[PDB]
Structures are given as structure tokens and as C-alpha cells.
């Protein structure tokens, strides 16, 4: 009914709205997205400082 | 005078290894101040938290210290009390 | 079956002299653990099973302070830097922090903190203006000590006034 | 009955309550999370300090 | 007939009673815990001071 409001008011689950939009809106099935989850998300922390650097890289470099 | 005084402390009041009610009795308010102090520290060691701290890691120094600010605040305020 | 003891020694039955304390160190041994100790202090703490001889000692202490000193950003400075007290923390239930050192201490509670400059007024203010060096990090490790004893002092006086 | 005071009476095992309220409140499959549990066994020392330092930095990432 | 009397004239065999203990008194199969002897047991010494310590921390941080 209105997708930018209720990403607005629960930001924390834009992953999850995410998912949702995904699945339904772009044609990917909803299997891959589960088993993607359930499999290689593993590396956690020391590369999420290289990931957050990665992220403002990639905003640096966007043009 | 000093070596008697010092001597006599040291044997009486605070080598032994036990402290009781009739060992305080002996002496005077300094005298009886300093030896609940020397049967606190003793039942502080024997807290369970400090016998535990002990039995894992032994480190009397750690444990020295806080009985040492300990022992100095209070005689502080004895001292200022009897004052 | 009672059998009063009347035979208790501190020294005998609750602090027993091990083998590192009351061992003064002759000059060689001075030496080695002046060379090969990071920290020293991590010298005085034996736990479990006593090393047979200083290098064992030495070595065990070294992998002690690199393990809390690698432990200190998740440790518990790390944890307690986000509110003592408005998160109600009890630090009587608490095992002992042998190596904590106030270092990852830096109390930033969020919530209690309003309108933030990150731009200091003056050069003045700005940080601590203690001259002297370590400064920022014994300030912090006094800190954390004065933190921890005060909510649990707090934590006494309620268990206390609950009782009476 | 009552699960937070239950909770809150053994907070040691607040894994064993979770582990129920996945297999009866959600509909997930005892076998999953068994064989789950029974893979993740190697608890490696070093692996359980990166997920101290890991959920430490999640939790004051939350927000 | 009586566990801690057994347990206390044999400590050798502290395994051995552990193992028997799981295996009527708990659930667990006997096979399971035959193949787990087999195949786990490999690392030796080197990490056997690490466990050491590693015991003697889970003790300083049972609560």
C-alpha cells in the first residue's frame, strides 16, 4: 500500500522490507534468498571495519 | 622506650596468626581499635569472595592493597573519633 | 559430634604462602623478569597449577597480558563505557577483573547525552589538562574503579535497607 | 504457563527456552536445529573472543 | 548401586564413569560415543597447556 512510510518509521528492518521487495516486486525466488542467508554471511566484526570502510568507498566513489 | 613498645606490638598484638575477643580485652582503645581492625581483615579473608579471589588467582598483593586503604581510612576516622 | 577446633591459622588455613610469593628474587632472576616481562604485575597472579620455574612464570605471564590486552576493547571497560548506572549494573555479581585496566573505559553514556558539540569551545578545555604522561589512562582506570565501587555501594545500601 | 518469570527465575537456560519457543511458537523443525547444534561444536577458544568482540559491537551498533 | 563411593576409590577412571553415566542414565548412544573417542582425541601437549588454562578460567569465571 505504501512502502516509504513503513520503511520510514522501522528502520530496523530494512533488511527485512528489503527481503520482501526482492522476492515479490523483483522476480527472485524466495529459496535462494533463504538458503543465501543461512549460508556464507559468516566473517563477522574485523571485517565489518573494512566493510564500513568499504561502504563510505564506495559513497566516495560513486559519482 | 620506642624498641619496647615496637617489639611488644609486634609479638602481641599482631604476629599471631588468630584474633579473639580476649586478646582484645588486654589492651587499651588504641589498643583494642587496631585489633578489631586485625580481626576484620582476618574475616575479610575469609569472605567468600575473597577466598575465592585467592584460590584462582593467589595474588596477595592485590589483596594487600585493599586491606591496606582500608586499614588507612579507618584508622583516620578512629583517630579523629577519639580526638 | 561437635569437636571444637580452637586450632584456626589464617596463614595455614585461608592465605597460603605459595611458591612466587615470598620468593625474593635473587639478581638474575631480577633481570630475566625485567627483560622478559611485559607487565610485571601479571608476575603475581598463579593460577592453577604453580610453573616449576621462572620461565614458565614468565612466559605464562606474557601470554596472560597479551591475551587482556587483545580482551580490553570487547572487555569489560569496553562494556561498562555505556552506562554504569542508567543501565543498572551490578557489580557485585562479578568475577574478580584481574586484568581489567581502566583503557577501554570511556563513559559515554547514550541518553544523558543531549546537545554535543564536537568542537571544543576553547583550546582550553578541550581534553584533561593534566601535564603529565599516561594521563587519560589512570584517570580512566580510577574512574572505572570509583564507577564500579560506587554502583556497588549503591547496590549494598539497597540490599541493606531491604533487610532492615 | 508463564514464560518470563520462568525465564527470568533460570536465566541459564535462556538457550533451552529458546530452543522451545523455536520448535513450538515458530514452526521450525527440531531436526534442523539439532543437527545445527551438533555441527556448531567446535567452540575454538579464539572463535568464542570474536564473538564477544563481535556481539559487543553489534550491541552498540544497534541503535 | 552407588556412584560416588565408585567414583572416589577409582578416580583414574573418571572417563570411564562419565561415559557409563551417559550412557544409561542419560540418552546417549553408545555408538555415538564410541565414533566421538575415535575421531576427536587428536590434538595433544602443545594445546594441553591451553586446556589447562582454559579449565582454570571456566573455573575463575563460573559464577
Same mark, same amino acid.
Given at each position: 500500500?505504501?512502502?516509504? %512510510?513503513?520503511?520510514? %518509521?522501522?528502520?530496523?528492518?530494512?533488511?527485512?522490507? %528489503?527481503?520482501?521487495?526482492?522476492?515479490?516486486?523483483?522476480?527472485?525466488?524466495?529459496?535462494?534468498? %533463504?538458503?543465501?542467508?543461512?549460508?556464507?554471511?559468516?566473517? $563477522?566484526?574485523?571485517?565489518?571495519?573494512?566493510?564500513?570502510?568499504?561502504?563510505? $568507498?564506495?559513497?566516495?566513489? $560513486?559519482? | 622506650?620506642?624498641?619496647?613498645?615496637?617489639?611488644?606490638?609486634?609479638?602481641?598484638?599482631?604476629?599471631?596468626?588468630?584474633?579473639?575477643?580476649?586478646?582484645?580485652?588486654?589492651?587499651?582503645?588504641?589498643?583494642?581499635?587496631?585489633?578489631?581492625?586485625?580481626?576484620?581483615?582476618?574475616?575479610?579473608?575469609?569472605?567468600?569472595?575473597?577466598?575465592?579471589?585467592?584460590?584462582?588467582?593467589?595474588?596477595?598483593?592485590?589483596?594487600?592493597?585493599?586491606?591496606?586503604?582500608?586499614?588507612?581510612?579507618?584508622?583516620?576516622?578512629?583517630?579523629?573519633?577519639?580526638? | 559430634?561437635?569437636?571444637?577446633? =580452637?586450632?584456626?591459622?589464617?596463614?595455614?588455613?585461608?592465605?597460603?604462602?605459595?611458591?612466587?610469593?615470598?620468593?625474593?628474587?635473587?639478581?638474575?632472576?631480577?633481570?630475566?623478569?625485567?627483560?622478559?616481562?611485559?607487565?610485571?604485575?601479571?608476575?603475581?597472579?598463579?593460577?592453577?597449577?604453580?610453573?616449576?620455574?621462572?620461565?614458565?612464570?614468565?612466559?605464562? &605471564?606474557?601470554?596472560?597480558?597479551? =591475551?587482556?590486552?587483545?580482551?580490553?576493547?570487547?572487555?569489560?571497560?569496553?562494556?561498562?563505557? &555505556?552506562?554504569?548506572?542508567?543501565?543498572?549494573?551490578?557489580?557485585?555479581?562479578?568475577?574478580?577483573?584481574?586484568?581489567?585496566?581502566?583503557?577501554?573505559?570511556?563513559?559515554? =553514556?547514550?541518553?544523558?547525552?543531549?546537545?554535543?558539540?564536537?568542537?571544543?569551545? =576553547?583550546?582550553?578545555?578541550?581534553?584533561?589538562?593534566?601535564?603529565?604522561?599516561?594521563?587519560?589512562?589512570?584517570?580512566?582506570? &580510577?574512574?572505572?574503579?570509583?564507577?564500579?565501587?560506587?554502583?556497588?555501594?549503591?547496590?549494598?545500601?539497597?540490599?541493606?535497607? &531491604?533487610?532492615?
Amino acid at each position: 500500500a505504501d512502502p516509504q %512510510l513503513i520503511a520510514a %518509521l522501522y528502520p530496523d528492518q530494512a533488511e527485512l522490507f %528489503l527481503t520482501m521487495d526482492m522476492m515479490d516486486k523483483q522476480g527472485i525466488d524466495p529459496q535462494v534468498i %533463504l538458503d543465501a542467508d543461512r549460508l556464507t554471511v559468516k566473517r $563477522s566484526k574485523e571485517q565489518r571495519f573494512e566493510d564500513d570502510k568499504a561502504f563510505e $568507498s564506495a559513497l566516495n566513489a $560513486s559519482k | 622506650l620506642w624498641r619496647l613498645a615496637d617489639k611488644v606490638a609486634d609479638e602481641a598484638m599482631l604476629r599471631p596468626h588468630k584474633v579473639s575477643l580476649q586478646d582484645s580485652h588486654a589492651f587499651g582503645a588504641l589498643g583494642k581499635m587496631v585489633m578489631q581492625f586485625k580481626s576484620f581483615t582476618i574475616k575479610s579473608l575469609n569472605s567468600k569472595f575473597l577466598r575465592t579471589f585467592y584460590d584462582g588467582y593467589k595474588n596477595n598483593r592485590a589483596i594487600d592493597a585493599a586491606l591496606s586503604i582500608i586499614t588507612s581510612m579507618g584508622l583516620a576516622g578512629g583517630f579523629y573519633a577519639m580526638a | 559430634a561437635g569437636r571444637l577446633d =580452637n586450632g584456626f591459622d589464617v596463614f595455614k588455613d585461608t592465605i597460603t604462602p605459595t611458591r612466587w610469593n615470598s620468593h625474593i628474587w635473587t639478581p638474575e632472576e631480577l633481570e630475566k623478569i625485567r627483560t622478559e616481562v611485559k607487565n610485571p604485575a601479571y608476575i603475581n597472579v598463579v593460577t592453577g597449577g604453580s610453573p616449576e620455574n621462572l620461565d614458565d612464570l614468565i612466559k605464562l &605471564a606474557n601470554e596472560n597480558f597479551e =591475551n587482556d590486552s587483545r580482551a580490553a576493547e570487547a572487555g569489560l571497560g569496553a562494556k561498562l563505557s &555505556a552506562g554504569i548506572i542508567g543501565a543498572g549494573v551490578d557489580p557485585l555479581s562479578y568475577v574478580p577483573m584481574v586484568g581489567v585496566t581502566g583503557k577501554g573505559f570511556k563513559l559515554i =553514556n547514550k541518553a544523558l547525552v543531549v546537545g554535543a558539540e564536537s568542537a571544543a569551545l =576553547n583550546v582550553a578545555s578541550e581534553g584533561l589538562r593534566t601535564s603529565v604522561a599516561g594521563g587519560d589512562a589512570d584517570y580512566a582506570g &580510577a574512574a572505572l574503579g570509583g564507577f564500579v565501587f560506587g554502583a556497588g555501594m549503591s547496590a549494598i545500601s539497597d540490599a541493606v535497607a &531491604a533487610g532492615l
